[model samples]
Structures are given as C-alpha cells and as structure tokens.
Target chain A: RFPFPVGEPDFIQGDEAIARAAILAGCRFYAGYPITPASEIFEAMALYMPLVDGVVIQMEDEIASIAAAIGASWAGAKAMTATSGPGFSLMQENIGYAVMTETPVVIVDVQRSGLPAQGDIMQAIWGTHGDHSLIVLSPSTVQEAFDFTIRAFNLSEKYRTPVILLTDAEVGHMRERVYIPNPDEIEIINRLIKRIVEKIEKNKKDIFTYETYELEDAVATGIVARSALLLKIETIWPFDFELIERIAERVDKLYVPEMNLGQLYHLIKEGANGKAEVKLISKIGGEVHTPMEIFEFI
Target chain B: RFPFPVGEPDFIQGDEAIARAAILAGCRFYAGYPITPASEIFEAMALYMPLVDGVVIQMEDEIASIAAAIGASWAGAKAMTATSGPGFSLMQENIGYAVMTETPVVIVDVQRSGLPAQGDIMQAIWGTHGDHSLIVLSPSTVQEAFDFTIRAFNLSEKYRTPVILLTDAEVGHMRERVYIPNPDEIEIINRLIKRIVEKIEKNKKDIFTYETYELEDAVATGIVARSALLLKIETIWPFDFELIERIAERVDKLYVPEMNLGQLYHLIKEGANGKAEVKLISKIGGEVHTPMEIFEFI
Candidate 1:
C-alpha cells in the first residue's frame, strides 16, 4: 500500500530526530534564535522546510522567533520555534499569549544545566523556580525526541494551544537510534478550522474545544456532559469541548499524567470543575537525576 | 469660588501628571521597562505605587511588565505599564491577549522617533502596525495628561479593555500646571462588574460594554434598539441581541472598526452584516500628509 522503500533506522542525536519529526509532521514554518544544544533544530529546519515548500526564518531574537511562529500559524501554517533557558525566559509573554488566544504552535526548550551564573552541562534541568505555568514535555532519548515531536504537533493541532517540548542538553546532544519508518508509516494530524461563511450561511453557533489530562468525574457532574473529552493525543488544541462532554458523560474515572509538581493536575481540576482524579506519572532516576536513560531502557 | 488654588496651578511635566492621575485613579500596580522619554512615567510610578499600598515592579523586559500587569489586573488591581518605541513593539501580542480576554489594564506609549531611517516621532507612532487592536488616547498638554489618565482608567474599567495613553517625548516632558481637584470634582466610571455578575446570575450570560462614538441613530434596527438615544451609553456584552435586533430593524448603515486601521466605525459594519454605510475618518491633514501635530492637539 505504501510507495516508498522503508530502510533500517539510522543513528542520530536526539535533537536531530526532533528536527526530522517536525518536518514529517508538516511543520511548514520554523523561526528560531540559536542557543546551545537546541540550535540544531534550527539548522535542520533550515535544510528541510524548503524541500516541503515551507519557510524557515532565523529571527533577530528568540522573542521574535516565537512571535513569527505565532504569526505564521495565524496564516494557516503549522509553525514552531525553539530555544534554551535564557531564550525561553524571553518567550514567556508570547507563550502566555498563545495560551490565552489559543494559538496552535510548538516550542522546543532544550534545558541547559545552569543560568549564566553556573554554567555546568551536568547541572539540573530546572531553572527559575517560581509560580509560572508552562506545558513542558521531557524526553530522555533520541527515540522519544522523534516520537514526542510527532506528539507535540498532534497536541498543538488538537488543542489549538501552544505545546512545549522540554528536553535537556544531555538528551538533546546524546546520540541514539531513532526509527524513522517510511513517511507513510507515520500518523499525522492537522489543526481544525471552521469556515466563517459556512457558519454564517447555516446560522449555526460555533463551539470551541478544550482538553485536560486527568480529573474526577463525580465533581464534574453538572458540567461534565458539556465539556470536551480529555483525549490523550500527541498533538494538542482546537479544543473540542463537545467531544469532552460526550466522553465525560460516560466516564467515572480519568487518569492524568503528571510530573515534579501537580501543575497539570491543577489545570485539569480548574477545567474539569473538580471532576477528574489525577494520577502521577513517575519518572525514573528518583526525579533528580538523568532519567531519560532509564526511561529508554524501560 | 473654586475650592482649591486655580491660577497658580500645580506645575508638572505631562508624564508626571500621568503618574499622579494613575495613582489617584487607584492604580495599585505598575510594571515597566525603562525606555527614553517615557522612563519618567516608570520612575514616577515606582515612587508612587508603594506609598499607596501598591506595588511597582521593574520587570526584566517590557513584555513581562505588561503580562504581569494583566495578571495583577485579573487578580483585582488597577495595573499599568509604560514604554517607548522599541518596547511598545514587544507589547503587541500581549495587547491582543488583553483585548480577547477582556482584561482591564492600562498601557502608556510615550512616543519617540524610530530609526532615523523612519522619519520623525509622528511617523514612528505607527511603527508596530498589525491586525491586533486596542483603544488609544492622545493627550496634547499636561492637563490633558491628567484628564486622559482619568479617562483612560474609566474607559478601561467600563469597557473591560486595555486603554493606551499615547503621548510623545515633547509633550511627556513638557511641564505645565495640572489642577488636581477634590475627590468629588472628578468622575470615575468603574467597569460594570456588578452588571456582569447580574447578567450571569439572572440570564446566565457574559457582559461586555463599549464606549461607542460617532454613530448614534444607526444602532437600533435589529432585535436591539438602534436610535442615537439608545447608543449614548456603551453597549453591554452578552450583547443585547434583542436590542441589536430592534436597532437593526431601523437603520441600513452600520460601521465596524477595522484592526490596524482607524476607529470602530468599521466594527459596526462587520458586526451588522456589512450592509451599512461605512465611512473612514479622515485626519486633519490631507490623506497624504496627515499632520502628526493633530494627534497632539487632540
């Protein structure tokens, strides 16, 4: 059924795999400001996007990089931008805008060890310990990078919200075998759009969708039936509230995957109205060490 | 006789008057990035917000400053931020967010000349042009700075939108006597939170208001009332469709505001099915050489 010849997987760094997966996911626009480890994604996009009739722009700054990505998405292109800690900090406002405006986009944050003060590659991944909200995905291996990029695109399109892919310098730079099957073998998802003219002609109301990870059903009794289903898709946004309501009406228990803090759990609770029971998705290496190696082995 | 001294007015630069008016208007939070000409407003806010049990934080960047201001406003505080040309460009995305989320806040753009390549201060005011939109008020004198600051606050609250006080370096630093009257002398129109709450409680709907200008009798044809009399007060959101229907029944002309374009006349047309007579407002100068001086005069 598939036309292309499928070859054996090639060994590549986790970061390279991320760039490849993005191209495969139909990311037509990429804008980035280069930093260590994550810079490769920009380099790869520079090479690949053109092959697919896409545009890859190297912006003046990380702030502008993300802004351009957002602008491109508004023009109906699947867009992404990448950065590290310092650049990530510059991106917070735009990221928040993506959240509020429900703009579908992706941000790849390859975590660095230290801030400018402490520059050790082996240091911790966490930076700026404060009360700020971000959707961060941590990948430990090259395979996950490929897998997660696909997921990131899916999540971004499904929810119509910006999804962040959080990796560290270690995983980003480390080499591993990433199984890239024939292009036909991969599953792809695109964002949903409503035709303004159609809605006007039918005199029908347009409903927006929202997705959540885990929650309890009992607490969401009254509104659960109206919410969009918390579908565990790889890509997010275009929040289908109708689907959530349909699933919520039938389910009594919901499982949410969480990390270090219960932030995701909090979001689900806020959105689900105390309905979804959240379950922790534990990481390997005791939450403080390089967990991706163990994750890959598992 | 006037209660306070009228002739020997309190002399202060336009920017300083803006600071005083913000404080008097109950602005309790200020966050800004230092930029030329407009730096005085940030400096003044830093000194004043604290004295009135308020907080003024100099953020790492202008984007963060505005985002934090929006956050603080959502948490029930009158918040404001200031910047000049470069910083103002960074604020567009968040400005759009404030518009969509219906967040009440204030932004001050003390105009400065852009790159010598762009021309003068007047030309630079149009720098960050795009599809996003917000309310912008221009003040010519220090007194207008004080008056517009108060008006800005009222409009922000009444409309549940971000209001921009647009002044330039020449006017901002120009000192003049700005009379401050007793509390009773000034008029304050806080947002219709009570009306919004009532709408939610009574009809289970959202509430929004607009400070509609120019068009008067054209608003009544649809289910809503369209007479100029009905258009006097800002229309509340959850939009009085019934009222709109009543108004639509009468007039064939409605003007809708266009983003990145002149005022709200264009919005009426777009919202009312584009069947109305839409006219674009002209500047004092011919369309080609519209004088920047006119903005100051207004």
Candidate 2:
C-alpha cells in the first residue's frame, strides 16, 4: 500500500519526511503530545506506526510522551517522539533520565520560531540537567530531515542515549524534494540483543561532522571571521574540538553566526580556548541568520 | 489531631521534617511516587495533606508526580513532590518546565546515598535541560533539612521557579533534634494572585550564604589548601561568585571537600578564575566527609 516512489526524489513536507524516515530507520514506537509545527509529525506517526504493527500513543503531556518512549525503548523497540518548543521544554528532565539510564530514544523538536531559527543549539546540548551529554542533529532541508532522522536513531541506538533531531518550523511545514534510500542502502543500529558512553568518547571523531567553506587556504586559516569562510557544524556535541582547534590555529578569528543569542559562540569559544578570537553574530526574533548579516558583520 | 509540640526542639526524621515544613510554608498540594529514601515524604503528605484540605496524589510514575505538582501550582495551590535519585531523574524535564514557565513548585530529593553524601549539589543546580537556573539548598542536618524545606517552598514562591531541597538518605531517615518554630515566627513567601529571573538576580545575596571557618587571619589566606579553614556553601547556585572571587583573592588556595568527585570543586575553580588554586577532597561509596579528613588534607 506504500505508493511513494522509493528510488527517486519525491515532493514532501519536512514533517512527513521525518515521519517516513523514522519508519525507514526502524522506529516502531512513537509517543507524543501534539503541538503546533510538530503536530503533522504526530499525525503522520499515527498513520504509519500502526501500519507496521508499531505503537503510537497520544500521551497526556510531553512529560508522559517522553516517559512512554523511554519505556518503549527499554521494551526493545526503537521508540521516538516529536514536539515543538513548549513540549520539547517539558521533556527536558526525562531526556536526562534517558541519558543516565542510557536508553536509546529519538526526539524530534520542530522549532516554533513558526520560525527556521537554530535557537535550541545549546538547549539541545545543555538543556537537560547535570553534566550529561547527548547527540543533536539540525537539518536545514527536508532531505536532511529525512537523512538525519534516520541518523538520529542510529546514533541513539549506537550510543544508548537520547538523540535530538533539532529542526525549525520553516523546515517542518515547507515542501521540498527528498530522496528516500532503499531499505538495503539504509543503516540501522539496534539495541544490544540483551541489554553505553565509551561508545561516544571513542567514536567522537566519527560522530562529529562540519563543512568548512573558503578555509581551503593553507588547507585553512580564519584571521577567519568576515572572510566569507563559513563553518557549519552538523553534529553539535562530542564537538569536533580537534577540527575547531585546528581551524582556530590557522584563523585570526572565528565568527559564529546563529539564531540564538550566543550559545554556540560560547561553546566554540570554550573549545577554541584562546586559540582564536571567537566572535558571536546573533539573530533573534524568530528569524534565521541570513548570509548578508554574516557578511555585514565580517 | 496534631500530636507533636511546637515552639521547641522536637525529634523528627529528615523526610518527615521536609513534609511538615512544606505544609507550614503554604504547600497544599503534594504529588509523588514512592521511592527509596523518600517514601516517608509521600506518606507524610498523604497523611497530612488532607488534614488541611490539601490534595495528595500518588501518580503512576515520577514524571507524572512532578507534572501534577506543576499543574497544581498553576491552579493556585502551593505544590510539592518528593523523590530519591531514581525518581528525581524522572522529574528532570518537568523541573525545566517549571523554570521556563516560571511556575512555583518545591521538589524534595531525599538522596538514596541510604547514606548523608552531598553528591547531588551539582545535579540539583544543573540537572534540568538548557541554560536554565534555579535554587538548590542542601541541608547538612535534619534541623537544616526542616529549615531548608520551608526555605525551598518560599524560594520557589518568591522566584516562581522550582526549588530543590537536596538531602541524602542518612538525613532522610535519621532522627534528629529540630526546632519546630511557632507558626508566627516562620517567614513565608507567597505567589502572586495572577502570576519571575529578575527576582533571583536582584535577591542573589539574600539567596546565597556560605560559612568560612578558621579563616579569620586577614579574614583569609590557602598557601590555603591545607588550612584548618573550611567554607560551607548552603545555597549551591547563583554561586555567590562575588564571595567566591573575594575569598579566592584572600587565599592562596581554596579547598573543596565533598562526597562527589569534585563537582563543587570544578565550579569553585571556574568562579575563582585563577585567583586561587582550588583543591578537591572527594569521598565516594556514599560516605560523608569527616573533620579529620579535612584536617588530614590540610
């Protein structure tokens, strides 16, 4: 009954891409409380989870939503939940519990910045309490939503911690062309047949990714801020400190342009640790950072 | 129906003292799931809550327990929940919610360290997700637990955020001499009729306290690490950075003795910011630090 083309790029909304990709990633249980910009994800899960004999629970609140998903993960299912900012905020404590207990669960947060804002950069990384660490992926496009949703589950299963796919409302509702890889091409990480942080620490390099633009000079150099050199971090934590330090050494300054105030900037500065002068270019008011803004700052 | 005498020193368990103090602090709604080192709190709430037309709910889980308390606080009732480490982990997300929404709620964590280990000092302050801040009070004695429990609710009301009373299992179950002050002498902070960070920032001094011992020479000096001097932090967050920096300036070194592996030590180092060298004396296996341990370290 699944009619959407499998090998070719198809038109889809970001939320639908996430839901379908979650299914492809072997996510079999979804529990969430509906919230704007994320309701479509819950709706799609409702339609698809049951088709695969998976379960979808409309929990009483976001707390229950995450609690249920964590319980399901313990029960041997790849479980997930999707929510907006408010609901996502409600899931903070349990997210930490999942980390401490090392339960593999995928949480998708479609920012209501109604907004393409990367405001939750720090929240996803440091939002939960204590000194715990987890994986967070932000997709700028519908396809990445599809790609990263699958990757989120893989990492969660691999690391045995909650993984957040942090997206924005602009991406959540926007229609885009997405290619769904065949099941054979997809990678799935499963919970131990029976029963994880050494996994993240040892695999730090393999887990972190970043795209550097215009840093090809001497393989790189930043003197780096305002040089039209852009460094995009895909994996927000287990940060590519090696890469950051390497780039900072070659650059005069590092410029961080983000939606929230200076969450990423602060972290980058911490990681850079005086290797380079780190500058923050912040944008708020539920708006995404524009290239021109970075240009002007430079 | 109350049997215990007031206005005098009374024998009480830490957990029972927390419950009684909460009631006197105007808490009228209690919801919590029974967990080790904290079951008595739930029991006391069940027994006493109804006596004052208060509500007590034993939720199916810890997540629900905190969620219900948050709701009750919104419904115009002073609310609280009690739990141990395992249950406290479950309540993490909702605690963040309380911080974000500026909702007044009291969370009592009777540490499971069955044991008076002050290991949760960091967890109580930094446990929730995001860059959120709240009040955390660790009472070193049963009497302190009683006093701090009331202060927790007052701070929660005064700040409109979750206030954590972090006490270990030893204190939870231990019988100790506590002064049950007359109701008139007890100071209480109430919530607004309609509806708070400006509160915390402005009232920081009133909120933070630390006691220094044997540091009266020049009021200090750590040349400070092995000094017979001791500094005790009652309020763990808002940090009293001024005090930390001031003391760090006066001392050659600052010594942090705690149950956990140097959490407070790390923070002190951060706040000291090179003003003084910070040393950590960590004790694990759920044991409290002894005077001789400090003496030996000095």
Give the candidate number with the greatest TM-score.
Answer: 2
CA error at residue A20 for candidate 2, angstroms: 4.6
All candidates' chain B TM-scores are 0.59, 0.88
Candidate 2, B12: how far from true, in Å?
4.4
**lDDT tens digits by residue: candidate 1, A1-298:** 2121134587887678888888878888999866677777877778777777888888878878988999999999999998774566556557656655678898886755331111111111112111112234445467777877887787677656676776656666768887887777778876701221122212212222233454444411001111212444221212222343345445664444322222223223323322333343322111232335223422
Cα lDDT of all candidates, in order? 0.55, 0.71
Give the 10-residue window scoring lowest on summed lDDT in candidate 2 chain B: B219-228
Best-fitting candidate, scored by lDDT: 2
lDDT of 2 by residue, A125-243 (tens): 65554445678877767888899899999888877778888777777888989988787788787671112344564577778866566656431111112123467666776666557
Weakest ten-residue segment in model 2 chain A by summed lDDT: A218-227
The sequence of per-residue lDDT tens digits that candidate 1 reaches over residues B185-296 is 6788765222432322243122333333444454221111111222421322223334333444466644321111222232233233222344432221112212242223
Each model's DockQ score: 0.03, 0.17
